[PDB]
Design a protein around this ligand. Structure first.
Ligand code: EMC
Ligand code: EMC
Ligand SMILES: [Hg+2]
Lengths: 124, 124, 124
């Protein structure tokens, strides 16, 4: 296995890696709405979801994967009432290639993020 | 890789698939107590859990897998006080074959479901 | 494919196994702060986190894996305010090897545990 590191996603500060490649698969850590420089995006839920996807895009590509090779995503949201809004952004990235997915509302997320998304993808 | 599609489980409406096959593994989306026609199952926690299992059975079989090949499941429930009830139904399907599992109470689930379950299984 | 069992981790009572090996990958069930004898270690978040890791170490080793081959972990904590404390202990185990990770505060964990962790690891 190998750790994935890219300056285009917030730095993994602490005991974890942005993602890991093992065999021919890639596992990302759960991405939250932080900018690469480590600041929380303070726009609405859509703006927060966009940063999450920019972060996912960066780690996926550094690992030799892409949204087109994602097989499973788990979405943790702070409020299920915002499902539709997060889904609108989500659908711009997984429009034709559609991964398996699970979505649940949690009590709280790191840095009180409104959304956190993790993915597993094939490395071709 | 292949998206799994079955008319014997609620349709995946939107940017996700009922399940995905990659390498020799199958990943399902989290299944909720909806009938194939899209209606939330009428009834208590056991009836809801049974519908979730009917949905998993449908996607597993379409993927060339079965409850006997499930390796890991994640169970999200609306109320931990109903754990025994969910477990009793869960046990009917994993009678002698026992997957790895994590079970937790979340704040809320899609469509206010009382239970949601996702599985990962080997494709024989 | 096969179930993993070790007397050095709490017995799996119910329809699940402590872990499952499929291909060259090990999937653990979520581990909570129970001692091998089945009772909650009493003590603060630090002691609870250490017990969860003792349990993970036992199932990992029985499966032929180790903390050094863990590729992804999912951490569930009862109180996000305890993130720093749990992270301090977590870092002692994933020191030179840093897996991908996701962390969320759910509504409730089995036995009102303060922390629960599941892992996926490579079997060398
Ligand atoms: C991607 C909507 Hg839970
Ligand atoms: C290991 C801190 Hg969520
Ligand atoms: Hg549970």
């Amino acid at each position: 296995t190998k750790a994935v590191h890219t300056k285009h996603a917030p730095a993994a500060i602490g005991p974890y890696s942005q993602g890991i490649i093992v065999n021919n698969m890639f596992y990302s850590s759960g991405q939250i709405p932080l900018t690469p420089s480590g600041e929380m995006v303070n726009g609405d839920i859509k703006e927060q979801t966009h940063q999450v996807f920019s972060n996912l895009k960066a780690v996926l590509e550094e690992a030799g994967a892409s949204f087109e090779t994602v097989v499973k995503a788990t979405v943790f949201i702070a409020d299920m009432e915002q499902f539709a809004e997060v889904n609108e952004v989500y659908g711009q990235y997984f429009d034709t290639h559609k991964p398996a997915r699970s979505c649940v509302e949690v009590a709280r997320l790191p840095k009180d993020a409104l959304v956190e998304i993790e993915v597993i993808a094939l490395v071709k």
